[model samples]
Target: EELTLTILRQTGGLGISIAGGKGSTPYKGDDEGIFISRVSEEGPAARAGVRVGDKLLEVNGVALQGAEHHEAVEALRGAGTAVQMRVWRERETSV
Candidate 1:
């Protein structure tokens, strides 16, 4: 299962930190989705309720299910200030 969320692109910054800030890839995790490491204090992402550990599933209606890390990040970065994202948040369960 997965969670669908939307994150507004920040005017100056997304207000969130990805797994790989630069150079490195940001798509690393259990095959479910790309993970977000942290969110900026006052960035649009924060205001939009984007949280750390949120799995990035899509961007502006573009599906990123199998996109490369750099490519995915690039897409978001290139996305306009009013970016839209589809994200997933993990939920804990009893074994």
Candidate 2:
């Protein structure tokens, strides 16, 4: 199966993420997906709207079910060459 991820924007900073579905690397929890462990103001993620600990769920209109980390990065970097992008954010809670 082919999965597509939607990276709204890009910005450099810090943090590691475990991407891909099932059989993906572990990070904080389970579910295995685009886990945004950190946000970098030095890159596009920050400049746009991405934040730390954000589990990227969607992009453009595609849901990042089992997409590749590199592919997601490309989707995000591929665009925004001359056009600005709008970010969609959803907050999660845990204890």
Candidate 3:
């Protein structure tokens, strides 16, 4: 299934710490998706509301789900200023 997240207008200096990879897709939690281990404090990613442990799904219009790590990295690098991206955050369910 295809999933899409709203575009995020971000700037450079957006720092992130990631872990895990698949066959080339570096920095991911598992086949389920990639997780952002950390976001630079008050950085582009942070300002855009990105948080640690957020599952990154795509950058710009390119899909990252099951994509090669190199492919995702290339797409992200090619993106210029104010890049658009999508992420998934787990919402707590009310008991």
Model 3: how far is 58 from its true place, Å?
A: 1.3
lDDT of 2 by residue, 1-95 (tens): 12332244324312223344445565446456666666655664555555665666655655565777777666555445332323334454665
Cα-based RMSD of the predictions, in order?
3.7, 6.5, 4.5
Off by over 4 Å in 2: 1-20, 80-92
Error of 2 at 47 (Å): 2.5
Model 1 lDDT, residue 37, Cα: 78
Which parts of model 1 are misplaced by more than 4 Å? 1-11, 20-29, 93-95
- Scored against the true structure, residue 92 in model 1 reaches a CA lDDT of 60
lDDT by residue for model 1 (1-95), tens: 46555566644677776664234554453353456777887778888878777777778888776566677778878877677877877676345
**Superposition error at 44 for model 3 (Å):** 1.0
Select the stronger candidate by TM-score from 2 and 3. Answer: 3
Error of 2 at 89 (Å): 5.9
Cα-based lDDT for every prediction = 0.69, 0.50, 0.61
Shift in Å, residue 83, candidate 1: 0.8
Candidate 3 C-alpha lDDT tens digits along 4-93: 433233544456655434564444333445667788886767766777777677778666777655566666667666667677776652
| lDDT, model 2 | 0.50
Candidate closer to the true structure by lDDT (higher is better), 2 or 3: 3
How does model 3 score by TM-score? 0.68
The superposed Cα distance between candidate 3 and the true structure at residue 43, in angstroms, equals 0.9
Count of residue pairs whose backbone atoms collide, per candidate = 1, 10, 2
